[PDB]
Amino acid sequence: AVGACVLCNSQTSLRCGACIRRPFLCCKCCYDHVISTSHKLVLSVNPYVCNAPGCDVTDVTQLYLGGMSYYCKSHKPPISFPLCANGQVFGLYKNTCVGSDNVTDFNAIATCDWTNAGDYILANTCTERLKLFAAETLKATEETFKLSYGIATVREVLSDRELHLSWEVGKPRPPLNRNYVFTGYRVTKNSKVQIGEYTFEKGDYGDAVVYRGTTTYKLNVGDYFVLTSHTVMPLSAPTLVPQEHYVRITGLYPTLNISDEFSSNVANYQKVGMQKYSTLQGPPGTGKSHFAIGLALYYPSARIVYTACSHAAVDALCEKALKYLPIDKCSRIIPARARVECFDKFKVNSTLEQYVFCTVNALPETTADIVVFDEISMATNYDLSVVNARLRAKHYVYIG
Amino acid sequence: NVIPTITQMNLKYAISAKNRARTVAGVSICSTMTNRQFHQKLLKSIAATRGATVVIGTSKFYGGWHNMLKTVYSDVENPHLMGWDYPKCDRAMPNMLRIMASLVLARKHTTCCSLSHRFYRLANECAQVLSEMVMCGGSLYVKPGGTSSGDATTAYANSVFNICQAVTANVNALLSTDGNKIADKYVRNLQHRLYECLYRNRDVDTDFVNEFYAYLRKHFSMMILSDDAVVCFNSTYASQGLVASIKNFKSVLYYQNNVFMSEAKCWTETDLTKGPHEFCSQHTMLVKQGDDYVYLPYPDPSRILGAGCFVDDIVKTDGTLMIERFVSLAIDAYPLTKHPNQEYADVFHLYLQYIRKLHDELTGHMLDMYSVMLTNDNTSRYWEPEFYEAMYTPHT
Amino acid sequence: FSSLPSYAAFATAQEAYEQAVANGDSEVVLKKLKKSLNVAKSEFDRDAAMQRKLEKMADQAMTQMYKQARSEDKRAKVTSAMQTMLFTMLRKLDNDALNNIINNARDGCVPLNIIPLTTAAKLMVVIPDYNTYKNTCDGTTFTYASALWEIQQVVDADSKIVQLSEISMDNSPNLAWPLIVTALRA
Amino acid sequence: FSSLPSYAAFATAQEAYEQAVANGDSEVVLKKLKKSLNVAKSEFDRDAAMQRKLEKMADQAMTQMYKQARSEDKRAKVTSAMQTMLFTMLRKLDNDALNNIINNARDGCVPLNIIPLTTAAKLMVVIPDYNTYKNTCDGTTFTYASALWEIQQVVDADSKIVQLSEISMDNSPNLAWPLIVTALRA
RNA sequence: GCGUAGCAUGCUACGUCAUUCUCCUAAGAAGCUA
RNA sequence: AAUAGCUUCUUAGGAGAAUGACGUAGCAUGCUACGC
Ligand SMILES: Nc1ncnc2c1ncn2[C@@H]1O[C@H](COP(=O)(O)OP(=O)(O)O)[C@@H](O)[C@H]1O
């Protein structure tokens, strides 16, 4: 059960239990995270609580390594050693971790509640590993906040799609939009059991609402709807690939004169082939994605992937691609999601089409020649990590 | 009753020196259970008897090779150790000799089982091992004959067939001699009674069988491990024509096995001291040790080096378990340390230094991962040439 | 075993035995202190046995966790270890032919089939650019893997045979690269 | 152990003995307390050893029961698997022609090889070369074992399909021999 | 002269603890030979 | 992903034996308090 110090990249065998994501910490790094922050739950290959039955000394600073088992001061074994000593914490590879001074920033990112611009403005400018960590922990934090608001119940039965909802009085109510789905638990006494997933819509008058469930279950009065959970997996791949230049064009092959109506962009169509990655700022209502399709023509057989953050945006761009390209084109966007609908054109899972149009949530893990994310003004460092992780291509261009 | 069966066929994955792939046949359990119950007593009684012809289950360690080699010279007159080898022994043994082998191994239940019982047992063994329904790659087939190497009674059946070829060649070589030129007055009478007891008679002759077998055991001492033989035949006779010779073995294999044993693989040593040229793939040297002289077995160095350098699985490539996988190689390669050729003298100290270096890097990594180590001291006894030198002495 | 409890008790018992045999005491007190020595030795011995047992119990885990970690590590990351070791050995081989084909394979010109051996057999290697072209090509001899081949039928990326004349830097930018060359061993 | 009757008697015996020694009476009470604690510790050894045996005995019995349950579970599962395979195999064979030929046989005994040789409805020829192809199963229909078959699919060694046109004397090298060609009785 | 008692010593039996040895079983990892 | 034989190593268990120490009972001997 080993890993790399999220600050010093040495092998370590520890984690912070009180910190939300429990990241690997080198020995001195964990010492510094635990000395001056209220976080005092450190997990080794086994937890560090005193193993004496009924002893709950949980501050790592107050335990002792015994023989085979650690303990608290009162219940300590005859001979043993103090754990937290000489600015270090006894962990595997104790001597060969280096440890660094990124302690203040990490403390901040760990204890903060993100409610002020500090966390964003700081995660935007910190170290890459630390950046990714801040992104994952912010996601998990907002996910945990999702749990704070309450449950819905039924009040009166009227029809199959006209129901009166009842909010648990005294808790934040959820916004009635398609982006909320809840599992329906019915309590007989004796078989508190889910009935299926449900989504609501505030009709023309309250408290009547029109709604859709995944199943055609008959809604009784003993039913209620509780929010459905969501988690976060950890990501490793970089956010922004290190920039590189060259003196020739490789992997992509030019064209002679095709599509003269895409003329002015060729001067930039070449430099993209010369560099490893680049960006295009497009003022509102400009020729953006026109340049995209034009380069797509300029390099015809070069396999291309398009991606964005907005489903409306990726739909619009896949349609525009349908307007001028051989088809011979797929938009593997969403099979059974996207409450506001989208393409109904081609495959979702075949990994064969040259020009793959997809969304971050449903990106596969394939290769290609060039990939282009779009609309960078909305996506976050996390989304950047996903789109750089799942795919792998020669050249990268972002337009926004 | 009888019970046909299906036996699979798999390619083997192990070191070798010829680019042909060797297969092995794994017989179906419904046959091994019965064969085991039927033969186990005799087989576990053959593998635990020291000082007889069939030498199976006699280690070469702790002074075993020297005792084998000094038993073979059971006081023959002018020794000349020889050898031989059968080509394609597993795929040419005629059905008749396999049946004779199974009969001679089933000749012990003279009182446990009745006669019809013995016959149905033999028919069962024939239909299960000899001519079965091989299943080679998702499609049945039919074996024409010839033994299979995955049943219970394999090495012992091979040993029996081997002794049968030796005695047949001997009989042929004694008959074919002219007869009027044999000077002695005993062996000539022996031939003159051999032919008559062979063809001009119909029932057993136990007294004469005994005399012939004693004559053999006094001029043709053997040592047999399932097809690897070593003979110590008297030589004046063998030249006058009265015991076997490589020419006679060539002939016998020509009309009974139906192959041709070219004489490029039948080593014939003429000096008794230096021992057999090659038996069971271990040359033999004579090495002074403790004021008396003993024989020692020593492998072929290239094989040891190969077994160290090329491993079959990826996890066996790190010196985690190697600290143990090397003690065994060194144990097998010790006798090279008394050879006169220098590289044979060095393929020992190579392993011996490698073990030490392995253990030192091990303590390094361990004292890094934690900071302590208590009693892994005994390993200081594997990198000294005394522990192995204990392994070829006769006390235990 | 100093810091252990019973070392002190047995030590003081042996010390008192010494002080009494040197003090010229009687034999009855000698026997009772012999008893004290026996019992202290007993307790210290039992505790020492217990501690030694705990030691030999810890060592099992201390030496098994290491095998586990190392073995799972080796087995997991192998598909890269093999390739890295391969290219290390291949640099260290220090051959010329291999070095030429490797550099070429780096900067684009890869072959599409097993290079043959005999003095009459086919070979189809691509060429991605004019620069690399004039780097390798010369007249009718196309040098590769340190041998002498002859150019047979240059083909464009649109299945359009071209002769050897048109291949010229100024004339280059109108061909649809990459070409595909076939050859024959001299 | 602590719940044994000797435990409390022994503890209070040692306690009251220490109390009387703190009282410092005549040594007859010392002898009495020695005797008391002696017999107490004797029966204490007795019961301690009994419990020590009981632990191992119960644990042996329990692991034995686990082993028995495991064996029975596996046994029942394997028997079900065997029966299922037997019945699903049986319900396949072409019962009609088999009934025909067996009931034709004068005893109900027919050597095994002719059973497939005369009731199989398929034929999986395997061919190692264009020549034996030409000479065994040419064209679209062929004859073997005195009956008329017809091709239906010619899958090569890579488990691909091969149109009957591709197999031509000049198109031999591109086809990864052997050539598993099936058929159907007709 | 005897017994009760006490002490000391030698012997025997029993019941605990520790050290070693020996053997047997079981289970596991690795090597070699036909 | 077979049959068989040998050998190195590790753990657990059992059995047995030796040794030493502790405690109980019994046997022997001596010294002495008391009693006749
Ligand atoms: N070279 C051009 N000639 C004519 N129209 C162009 C050219 N480049 C871009 N456009 C047009 O701009 C229009 C779309 O702009 P839009 O994509 O709406 O702006 P933005 O993408 O920045 O939000 C399209 O009609 C597109 O063809």
Ligand SMILES: [Mg+2]
């Ligand atoms: Mg756009």
Ligand SMILES: [Zn+2]
């Ligand atoms: Zn660190």
Ligand SMILES: [Zn+2]
């Ligand atoms: Zn913390």
Ligand SMILES: [Zn+2]
């Ligand atoms: Zn405690």
